[PDB]
Each structure stands twice: as C-alpha cells, then as structure tokens.
Amino acid sequence: TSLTAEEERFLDAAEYGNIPVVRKMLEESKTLNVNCVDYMGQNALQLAVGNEHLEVTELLLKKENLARIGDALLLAISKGYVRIVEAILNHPGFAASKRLTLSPCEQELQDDDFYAYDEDGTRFSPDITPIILAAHCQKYEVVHMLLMKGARIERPHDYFCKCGDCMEKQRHDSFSHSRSRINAYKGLASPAYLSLSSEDPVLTALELSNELAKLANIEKEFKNDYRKLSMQCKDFVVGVLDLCRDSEEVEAILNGD
C-alpha cells in the first residue's frame, strides 16, 4: 500500500465513523491531504458516506479542497441518506456552479475528479445525473430536494432529430447515446419524478406513456425497455385514479380543469 501510516489511521476512523479521531487528525496537521486513497481505491469522504455518518461527512466537507464530491453525492442519492445529501448540496462547490444540473459526461472539460470513481470511470453510467439517479431509485425526498435547486431531467430530443448536438453524439458511441436516452426516459417515467415534477401529473404520465410506446415501436432493439417504462406510466395513472374516495376527485381525474 502506497499510503502512509497517518492517513491510514485517518481513514480507518473515517470509515468506522469515529468522530473525535478524524477531527483531531484533520485539525492543523501539516501533512494528511484529505484527498488520499485507501485499500479499495476509495476516499475518506466516500467511506464516510457509504456507511451513514453525517458528522464525519460534514467535518470532511469543511475542508476546502476535497476530491470526488460528486461521487459522494451519487452514493448518498443511491441510498436513503437524505441528511448527507442536504449537507453535500450545501457545499459551496455546488452552490455557485452548474455542476449539479448537467451530467458528468458533458458538464465541463472534466479535468477535475468531481464525479470520479476508483480510477477508470464513474460509479454509474456517465450519462446519469444526480436527479436522474434519484428518479431511478424512487427517492421522493431526494427528488424534491434536487428539484428545489432547479435540477430537472431534460427531456431527450426526438429520435429523428438532426440538430448538431444529437448528430455529434450519434457519430461516436451511438450505443452510448441510445443508452443515455433510455436512462433519461427511465428517470422521467419514475413515479417519484412524475408526481413531484409538474402540476397535473396524470396528463404528464399519459402523454409520456404514449411517447414511450411510439419510441418502442420506432427503436425495436430496446422495445422491451420502452414498453416497461410505458407500463410504469400507465400504472402510475391507474394508481392515482384508484386513490379517489369522493365523487369530486373522480370527476377531477376523469376530466381536467
């Protein structure tokens, strides 16, 4: 292990959540850069977030230069740790930047290891955003939090779009482009994002069901994926209809305003 002894002493306590040892270690030590690594290639912050420890994650976030913050956010969103998500969103790195909204694949030059995982690639697909991942996992609290910050799933372009961006993404890694479209639609078709996304979500779900059925007929390779998403939308609509227990609510769902 290339790591030295002091940073190992730091990381063991950070992983196992011993608040005072980590606090004493990172307070005024000349060495012990917080961006150090571990046996599995992980980080102090990622080991702290992997096993829910709001205190350790907060005291690590106090440090100005901390690496792999976006990976920690995606790991917290993957789980139900809403407090850790709030803490990481309160970080000044997210506040004054566009990093939260746009995907890790196309956010910036990406020289910084903002969303990086161990060494080679991101934890999840490079197309998945924090909000798309929250919709995938169906975390209602996290979806609402990310929607408050203005992070919304961008509806993918039409299949036959010929804009310069879609053509450029089609030239290289057309498979990855199709996979990213499917991820965006699986995020949009999530009951969490459907309910918390917009006013009148039953009409949104019906229209998205129709759109996904048409794209299932068009693609014909990922037909089963799009049909599953269309069934998700149909089930959401039927579930919203089922909860009605007055005639006024039934009338409101059966015909709009």
Question: For Zn ion, which residue of 102, 105, 166, 196 counts as binding (CB under 5 A)?
Answer: 166
For a second copy, which is the closer residue by CB, 28 or 246? 246
If one asks whether residue 217 binds a second copy (CB under 8 A), the answer comes out as no
Question: For Zn ion, which residue of 23, 83, 149, 157 counts as binding (CB under 5 A)?
Answer: 157
If one asks whether residue 224 binds a second copy (CB under 8 A), the answer comes out as no
Indicate the Cα dihedral angle 42, 43, 44, 47, nearest 10°: -40
For Zn ion, which is the closer residue by CB, 39 or 159? 159
Q: Cα–Cα distance between 135 and 145 in angstroms, integer?
A: 12
If one asks whether residue 179 binds a second copy (CB under 8 A), the answer comes out as yes
Flag whether 52 is marked binding: yes
Name which of Zn ion, a second copy, none residue 176 binds, using a CB cut-off of 5 to 8 Å depending on partner kind.
a second copy
If one asks whether residue 120 binds a second copy (CB under 8 A), the answer comes out as no
If one asks whether residue 160 binds a second copy (CB under 8 A), the answer comes out as no
Stretch (H or E) spanning 199 = none
If one asks whether residue 179 binds Zn ion (CB under 5 A), the answer comes out as no
> Under the phi-then-psi rule, with left for phi > 0, alpha for psi from -120 to 50, and beta for the rest, what region is 3?
beta
Q: Cα–Cα distance between 105 and 168 in angstroms, integer?
A: 14
- Residue 116 DSSP SS3: strand
Distances (CA, A) of 58 to 27, 33, 92, 148: 14, 17, 13, 21
Binding-site residues from annotation for Ca(2+): 52
